[PDB]
Amino acid sequence: SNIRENPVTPANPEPSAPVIDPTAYIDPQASVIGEVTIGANVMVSPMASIRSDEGMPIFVGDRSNVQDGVVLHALETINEEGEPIEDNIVEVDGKEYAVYIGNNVSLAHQSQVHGPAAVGDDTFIGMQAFVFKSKVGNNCVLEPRSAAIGVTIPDGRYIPAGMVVTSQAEADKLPEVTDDYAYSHTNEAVVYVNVHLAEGYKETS
Amino acid sequence: SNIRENPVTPANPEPSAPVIDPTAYIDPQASVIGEVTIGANVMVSPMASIRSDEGMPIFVGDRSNVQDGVVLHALETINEEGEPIEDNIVEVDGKEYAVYIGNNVSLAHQSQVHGPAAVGDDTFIGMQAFVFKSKVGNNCVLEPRSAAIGVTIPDGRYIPAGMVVTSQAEADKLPEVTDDYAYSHTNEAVVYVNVHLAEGYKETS
Amino acid sequence: SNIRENPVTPANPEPSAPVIDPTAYIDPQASVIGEVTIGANVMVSPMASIRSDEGMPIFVGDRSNVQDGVVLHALETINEEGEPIEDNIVEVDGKEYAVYIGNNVSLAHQSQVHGPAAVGDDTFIGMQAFVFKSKVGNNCVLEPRSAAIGVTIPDGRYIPAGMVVTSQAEADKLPEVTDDYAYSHTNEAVVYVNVHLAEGYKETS
Ligand SMILES: [Zn+2]
Ligand SMILES: [Zn+2]
Ligand SMILES: [Zn+2]
C-alpha cells in the first residue's frame, strides 16, 4: 500500500501509521509514510511524498492541498539516546511538530517544505518553492521558485519569484500583500478548486 | 490504472479520458489524468504527472518527450458559472488550450509547464526549468533552472541557466541561438534519442 | 516491476538489468531502470527515478542515499555507429561511467545529478540542487537550490544556497567547509540516519 507505517529505528521504537480524515483524498500514486496527520478535505496529488520517519509528526491542516511532486520530510527530532533535538522541533499552539502545515494552505506543484518548518494558514507556497528551517506566517505568498531558509516570514508578506531569502534582515523587509498584488487572491481560488477536486476524486474511488 | 479520467466538478460536468496515439509510450509509473491529447512517438517517463482536471485540453505534440518528474497542470479555464476565463486559455492555430506543447519539444527532467502556457516546436525546456503564464516561441532553449513567467519569448532565443524572466522588457532582449551556442543542437539530439527510446520501451510492454 | 531492464535501441544491443546489493533498500514507489549498480546499505526513497538507458553505467556507491523525487539520468555515451562519445563519459579510478556517485553521498530530496557527472565521497547534494557536466569533489556541500554546470568543484568547498556556478573561475573561488560552517556536519548525520532507515525499511519488506 502507498499509505504505510514508518520503520523501527534506534530513535523510533514504535511504528506509527498515518491518521487521515475520511474526507481527504490521497492519490494512489502519492506516498504517505509514518507519523502524519492529514486534515479534512485535503487533496494529495500524484507523485507527492509525505514521509515522517525521523520522529515527531508532520501535520497538514484542513482544506490544504499537497500538489504533484511535493515533498514533505523532516530532520531527526529524537536522537539515538532518546534525547529530543529541540532545534529541529517547531512549536505551534502548545504542541510540537516536525513540520506544521496550517489550514487552507496550498503547497503547489514540485514545492518542498522540509522540517523543521511551520506554514501558517491561508498561505500559498508556489510552484518549485522551498521552505526549510523557517516559519512562514499566515496570509503569505511564496511566488514560484522562491525559497525561505532559516528565517521567519512575517504575516501578510510575499517573496518575489526566484528570490532566496536566508537572513532575517531580508525577511523583515519583504513587501506586503495588497489587494492589487498579482497573487493576492491566488490561494483562496486554489483552495476553493482543490476542495472540490478532492470531493470529485473521492467519488471515483 | 495510471491513465485515468478526470472527476466531475462544478466546472466539469463530463469526465474526459486521455487521447493517446498508439505509438506513444506512457511509463507505468507516470500519471496521465483527464482531458489530455498525446501525439505520436511521445515518450512519457517515470514520475511525470500530466493532469488536466480544471477544464480545457493539455496537448502534447508529435515526437515530444515528457521526462522524469515533469509536471503539466493548468489554472481553471471555466468557472463554476460555466463562464470561460479567457485570461487562462491560450490560443494556437485557431484552437483553445490550457497548455499547448508543440511538436519535437523536450520537457527535460523535473521541469514544469503550468497553464496557461504554450511552447512552440523544436524547443528545449531544460532540467528543473519552469514556464507559467507564458508563450515560448519555436526553436528556443530554456537552460537548466531558467524560468519564464508572464512573458512571451521570441522565436530562436535562449534563457541562460538560473535566470528568472518576469518582464517583457527582459524577454525582448534575450540572446539568440546561434550555431556556436552550447545548446544549439541539444534539442534535435534529445528528440532523436527519445523517439527511439519510446519505440524500444513499447517493445517491452 | 519497478526494477527493470533498459530497452534495445540502436546504441544498446543488449539490455542490462540493475545490479543491487542485497543490503540496499529500493522503495516500491521508486523506479530503477537499466545499467545501474547500487552499493551496500543504500536507501532509494519514493518517487526517485534512476534511469540508465543511453549507454554506460550509473553507479551509486556504498552508504549513499537517493532521496524522494531525485532524478539520475545521463546523455548518450554511445552513438548509433557504436562510437563512444568521450565528452559524455566520466573517468573515475580507471573506469568509465555516465554518472558516478561515490560512497557516503547524500542526494537530498528533489535534487538531480545528470550525466556526465561525478560526485565524490562524503558530499551532500542539497534539496532541489542540480549537477550536470560537472565533477564535484569529496567532502563538498551543495546547499539547497545551488547548481554546478560544466565545472569542477574542488574538494572541501561549498556552494551557497541558490548560487548557480557555470564557470571554472567561479568554482575555483568557492568558500571552504570549516568546522564552524552551518552544514559542516550535515552529511555525516544524514548518512548515519539513512543507513539505519534502509535497515528498518528492509525489515518491513
Ligand atoms: Zn529530509
Ligand atoms: Zn496547477
Ligand atoms: Zn536526461
Tab-separated table of N, CA, C and O in Angstrom, chain B residues 25 27-29 43 45-47 67-69 108-110 127-128 144-145 161-162 182-183 189-190 192-194 196-197 199-201 203-204, chain C residues 2 4 7-10 29-31 33 47-49 51 53-54 69 71 73 76 80 110-112 114 128-130 132 145-147 149 164:
chain	number	residue	atom	x	y	z
B	25	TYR	N	4.588	6.079	-25.827
B	25	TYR	CA	4.876	5.188	-24.689
B	25	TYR	C	4.613	5.988	-23.396
B	25	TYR	O	5.235	7.032	-23.172
B	27	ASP	N	4.985	5.529	-19.417
B	27	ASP	CA	5.556	4.637	-18.426
B	27	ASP	C	4.494	4.288	-17.393
B	27	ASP	O	3.670	5.118	-17.035
B	28	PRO	N	4.499	3.059	-16.906
B	28	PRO	CA	3.519	2.669	-15.882
B	28	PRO	C	3.626	3.492	-14.605
B	28	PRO	O	2.654	3.546	-13.854
B	29	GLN	N	4.789	4.105	-14.350
B	29	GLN	CA	4.942	4.933	-13.164
B	29	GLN	C	4.768	6.419	-13.448
B	29	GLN	O	5.075	7.254	-12.586
B	43	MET	N	7.357	10.097	-25.658
B	43	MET	CA	7.812	9.313	-24.521
B	43	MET	C	7.492	10.017	-23.210
B	43	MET	O	7.995	11.116	-23.005
B	45	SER	N	7.989	9.638	-19.245
B	45	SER	CA	8.897	8.905	-18.355
B	45	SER	C	8.329	8.700	-16.962
B	45	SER	O	7.297	9.282	-16.576
B	46	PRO	N	8.998	7.868	-16.159
B	46	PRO	CA	8.557	7.644	-14.779
B	46	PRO	C	8.427	8.939	-13.999
B	46	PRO	O	9.233	9.869	-14.117
B	47	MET	N	7.379	8.976	-13.174
B	47	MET	CA	7.148	10.037	-12.190
B	47	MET	C	6.664	11.330	-12.823
B	47	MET	O	6.483	12.303	-12.089
B	67	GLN	N	9.846	14.181	-19.610
B	67	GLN	CA	10.828	13.391	-18.876
B	67	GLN	C	10.479	13.236	-17.392
B	67	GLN	O	9.418	13.646	-16.937
B	68	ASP	N	11.389	12.591	-16.660
B	68	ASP	CA	11.057	12.092	-15.310
B	68	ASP	C	10.707	13.268	-14.403
B	68	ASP	O	11.438	14.255	-14.361
B	69	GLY	N	9.611	13.127	-13.666
B	69	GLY	CA	9.301	14.141	-12.669
B	69	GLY	C	8.712	15.417	-13.252
B	69	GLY	O	8.525	16.368	-12.464
B	108	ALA	N	12.541	18.560	-20.179
B	108	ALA	CA	13.562	17.747	-19.524
B	108	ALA	C	13.273	17.532	-18.027
B	108	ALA	O	12.403	18.180	-17.430
B	109	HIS	N	14.033	16.620	-17.437
B	109	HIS	CA	13.689	16.097	-16.094
B	109	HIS	C	13.412	17.211	-15.093
B	109	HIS	O	14.184	18.155	-14.952
B	110	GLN	N	12.307	17.029	-14.369
B	110	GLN	CA	11.896	17.903	-13.256
B	110	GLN	C	11.465	19.300	-13.688
B	110	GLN	O	11.260	20.155	-12.823
B	127	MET	N	16.369	21.097	-17.701
B	127	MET	CA	16.151	20.417	-16.416
B	127	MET	C	15.777	21.441	-15.337
B	127	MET	O	16.416	22.484	-15.195
B	128	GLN	N	14.734	21.115	-14.567
B	128	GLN	CA	14.284	21.979	-13.447
B	128	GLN	C	13.764	23.349	-13.877
B	128	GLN	O	13.642	24.229	-13.042
B	144	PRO	N	18.962	24.842	-18.079
B	144	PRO	CA	18.518	24.334	-16.768
B	144	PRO	C	18.281	25.434	-15.758
B	144	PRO	O	19.041	26.420	-15.713
B	145	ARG	N	17.244	25.259	-14.943
B	145	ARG	CA	16.928	26.195	-13.862
B	145	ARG	C	16.502	27.576	-14.315
B	145	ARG	O	16.422	28.468	-13.481
B	161	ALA	N	21.060	29.647	-17.911
B	161	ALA	CA	20.805	28.867	-16.694
B	161	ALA	C	20.578	29.765	-15.476
B	161	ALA	O	21.354	30.704	-15.197
B	162	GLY	N	19.520	29.456	-14.733
B	162	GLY	CA	19.228	30.136	-13.491
B	162	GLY	C	18.468	31.448	-13.605
B	162	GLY	O	17.996	31.958	-12.597
B	182	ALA	N	26.236	26.713	-27.051
B	182	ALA	CA	26.426	25.368	-26.498
B	182	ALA	C	25.195	24.440	-26.634
B	182	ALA	O	25.345	23.231	-26.829
B	183	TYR	N	23.990	24.993	-26.532
B	183	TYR	CA	22.780	24.157	-26.605
B	183	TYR	C	22.082	24.244	-27.976
B	183	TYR	O	20.911	23.889	-28.095
B	189	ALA	N	19.067	16.422	-30.814
B	189	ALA	CA	19.663	15.164	-30.314
B	189	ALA	C	18.743	14.448	-29.326
B	189	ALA	O	18.546	13.227	-29.413
B	190	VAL	N	18.167	15.205	-28.399
B	190	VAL	CA	17.311	14.654	-27.351
B	190	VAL	C	16.027	14.080	-27.996
B	190	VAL	O	15.571	13.004	-27.632
B	192	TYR	N	15.740	12.953	-31.108
B	192	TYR	CA	16.117	11.754	-31.861
B	192	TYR	C	16.225	10.558	-30.925
B	192	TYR	O	15.664	9.477	-31.182
B	193	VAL	N	16.937	10.754	-29.824
B	193	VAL	CA	17.095	9.668	-28.853
B	193	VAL	C	15.768	9.243	-28.232
B	193	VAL	O	15.511	8.049	-28.091
B	194	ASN	N	14.920	10.180	-27.846
B	194	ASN	CA	13.685	9.842	-27.160
B	194	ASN	C	12.671	9.191	-28.071
B	194	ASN	O	11.890	8.369	-27.609
B	196	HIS	N	13.496	7.120	-30.373
B	196	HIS	CA	13.962	5.723	-30.379
B	196	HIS	C	13.756	5.001	-29.070
B	196	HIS	O	13.471	3.787	-29.065
B	197	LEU	N	13.898	5.718	-27.958
B	197	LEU	CA	13.589	5.101	-26.662
B	197	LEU	C	12.120	4.716	-26.558
B	197	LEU	O	11.799	3.643	-26.023
B	199	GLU	N	10.135	3.760	-28.870
B	199	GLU	CA	9.897	2.534	-29.635
B	199	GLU	C	10.470	1.326	-28.890
B	199	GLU	O	9.856	0.261	-28.826
B	200	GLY	N	11.654	1.481	-28.297
B	200	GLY	CA	12.236	0.383	-27.541
B	200	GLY	C	11.407	0.019	-26.304
B	200	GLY	O	11.222	-1.186	-26.013
B	201	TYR	N	10.912	1.027	-25.587
B	201	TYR	CA	10.102	0.725	-24.401
B	201	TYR	C	8.782	0.092	-24.820
B	201	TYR	O	8.274	-0.773	-24.126
B	203	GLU	N	8.388	-2.015	-27.062
B	203	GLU	CA	8.646	-3.404	-27.410
B	203	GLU	C	8.809	-4.287	-26.169
B	203	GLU	O	8.947	-5.507	-26.298
B	204	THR	N	8.803	-3.670	-24.991
B	204	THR	CA	8.947	-4.381	-23.707
B	204	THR	C	7.625	-4.448	-22.963
B	204	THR	O	7.561	-5.027	-21.886
C	2	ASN	N	9.123	-2.345	-10.626
C	2	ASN	CA	9.775	-1.028	-10.620
C	2	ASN	C	11.301	-1.094	-10.738
C	2	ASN	O	11.976	-0.055	-10.738
C	4	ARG	N	13.810	-2.643	-13.500
C	4	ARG	CA	13.561	-3.093	-14.878
C	4	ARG	C	14.822	-3.002	-15.732
C	4	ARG	O	15.706	-2.201	-15.458
C	7	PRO	N	15.643	-0.823	-22.563
C	7	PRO	CA	15.180	-1.390	-23.826
C	7	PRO	C	16.312	-1.494	-24.837
C	7	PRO	O	17.353	-0.846	-24.673
C	8	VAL	N	16.094	-2.291	-25.871
C	8	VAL	CA	17.017	-2.344	-27.003
C	8	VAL	C	16.834	-1.090	-27.857
C	8	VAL	O	15.705	-0.737	-28.215
C	9	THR	N	17.941	-0.414	-28.161
C	9	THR	CA	17.940	0.761	-29.032
C	9	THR	C	19.105	0.620	-30.000
C	9	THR	O	19.926	-0.288	-29.844
C	10	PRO	N	19.187	1.513	-31.002
C	10	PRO	CA	20.305	1.410	-31.956
C	10	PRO	C	21.687	1.532	-31.297
C	10	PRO	O	22.673	1.061	-31.867
C	29	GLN	N	7.909	2.522	-4.661
C	29	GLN	CA	7.476	3.646	-5.476
C	29	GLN	C	8.637	4.430	-6.074
C	29	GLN	O	8.430	5.526	-6.612
C	30	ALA	N	9.827	3.850	-6.032
C	30	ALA	CA	10.952	4.369	-6.812
C	30	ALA	C	11.009	3.621	-8.131
C	30	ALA	O	10.373	2.580	-8.296
C	31	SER	N	11.769	4.151	-9.080
C	31	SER	CA	11.978	3.474	-10.369
C	31	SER	C	13.495	3.353	-10.617
C	31	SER	O	14.204	4.341	-10.523
C	33	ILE	N	15.981	1.675	-13.586
C	33	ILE	CA	15.929	1.060	-14.922
C	33	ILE	C	17.324	0.985	-15.504
C	33	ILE	O	18.033	1.994	-15.508
C	47	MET	N	9.533	7.889	-5.263
C	47	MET	CA	9.466	8.853	-6.366
C	47	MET	C	10.831	9.175	-6.947
C	47	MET	O	10.895	10.012	-7.851
C	48	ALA	N	11.894	8.523	-6.467
C	48	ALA	CA	13.172	8.700	-7.159
C	48	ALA	C	13.144	7.950	-8.480
C	48	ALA	O	12.485	6.915	-8.590
C	49	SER	N	13.878	8.471	-9.461
C	49	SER	CA	13.962	7.798	-10.750
C	49	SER	C	15.419	7.714	-11.119
C	49	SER	O	16.034	8.740	-11.338
C	51	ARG	N	17.638	6.177	-14.061
C	51	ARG	CA	17.313	5.639	-15.373
C	51	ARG	C	18.588	5.651	-16.194
C	51	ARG	O	19.145	6.699	-16.481
C	53	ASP	N	19.553	4.360	-19.618
C	53	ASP	CA	19.068	3.767	-20.836
C	53	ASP	C	19.708	4.406	-22.073
C	53	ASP	O	19.335	4.100	-23.190
C	54	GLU	N	20.789	5.163	-21.880
C	54	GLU	CA	21.506	5.719	-23.040
C	54	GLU	C	22.975	5.304	-23.122
C	54	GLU	O	23.778	5.972	-23.795
C	69	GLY	N	12.063	11.888	-5.011
C	69	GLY	CA	11.971	12.776	-6.161
C	69	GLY	C	13.306	13.042	-6.841
C	69	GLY	O	13.315	13.880	-7.767
C	71	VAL	N	16.294	12.641	-9.441
C	71	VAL	CA	16.435	12.000	-10.748
C	71	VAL	C	17.926	11.848	-11.068
C	71	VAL	O	18.714	12.784	-10.895
C	73	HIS	N	20.046	10.531	-14.511
C	73	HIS	CA	19.930	10.120	-15.923
C	73	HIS	C	21.193	10.616	-16.605
C	73	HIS	O	21.939	11.344	-16.000
C	76	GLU	N	23.584	10.534	-23.952
C	76	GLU	CA	24.093	9.397	-24.721
C	76	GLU	C	25.629	9.287	-24.669
C	76	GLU	O	26.340	10.273	-24.869
C	80	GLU	N	24.873	5.980	-32.555
C	80	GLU	CA	24.249	4.921	-33.348
C	80	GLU	C	25.274	4.066	-34.085
C	80	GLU	O	25.008	2.914	-34.424
C	110	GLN	N	14.522	15.924	-4.197
C	110	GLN	CA	14.272	16.699	-5.425
C	110	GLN	C	15.537	17.205	-6.109
C	110	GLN	O	15.431	17.998	-7.047
C	111	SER	N	16.707	16.777	-5.649
C	111	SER	CA	17.924	17.131	-6.400
C	111	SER	C	18.007	16.306	-7.695
C	111	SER	O	17.213	15.385	-7.940
C	112	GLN	N	18.998	16.623	-8.525
C	112	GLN	CA	19.164	15.863	-9.768
C	112	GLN	C	20.653	15.894	-10.106
C	112	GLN	O	21.288	16.938	-10.014
C	114	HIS	N	22.812	14.834	-13.380
C	114	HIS	CA	22.630	14.367	-14.756
C	114	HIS	C	23.998	14.189	-15.399
C	114	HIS	O	24.862	15.083	-15.364
C	128	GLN	N	16.752	20.116	-3.916
C	128	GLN	CA	16.497	20.863	-5.173
C	128	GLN	C	17.760	21.296	-5.916
C	128	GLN	O	17.678	22.146	-6.786
C	129	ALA	N	18.921	20.770	-5.553
C	129	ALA	CA	20.152	21.186	-6.218
C	129	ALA	C	20.296	20.439	-7.542
C	129	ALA	O	19.567	19.493	-7.817
C	130	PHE	N	21.267	20.849	-8.347
C	130	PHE	CA	21.390	20.350	-9.719
C	130	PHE	C	22.872	20.234	-10.060
C	130	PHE	O	23.632	21.181	-9.847
C	132	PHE	N	25.377	18.896	-13.373
C	132	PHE	CA	25.332	18.434	-14.767
C	132	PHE	C	26.645	18.818	-15.409
C	132	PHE	O	27.099	19.959	-15.251
C	145	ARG	N	19.139	24.328	-3.507
C	145	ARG	CA	18.936	25.192	-4.672
C	145	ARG	C	20.206	25.682	-5.335
C	145	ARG	O	20.124	26.566	-6.178
C	146	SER	N	21.373	25.154	-4.961
C	146	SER	CA	22.596	25.528	-5.702
C	146	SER	C	22.675	24.659	-6.978
C	146	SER	O	21.946	23.669	-7.104
C	147	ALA	N	23.592	24.980	-7.877
C	147	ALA	CA	23.771	24.194	-9.106
C	147	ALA	C	25.218	24.302	-9.538
C	147	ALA	O	25.858	25.342	-9.339
C	149	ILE	N	27.255	23.495	-13.144
C	149	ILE	CA	27.068	23.066	-14.531
C	149	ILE	C	28.373	23.346	-15.265
C	149	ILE	O	28.793	24.510	-15.381
C	164	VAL	N	24.205	29.515	-8.797
C	164	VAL	CA	24.347	28.680	-9.989
C	164	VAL	C	25.746	28.928	-10.543
C	164	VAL	O	26.053	30.030	-11.008
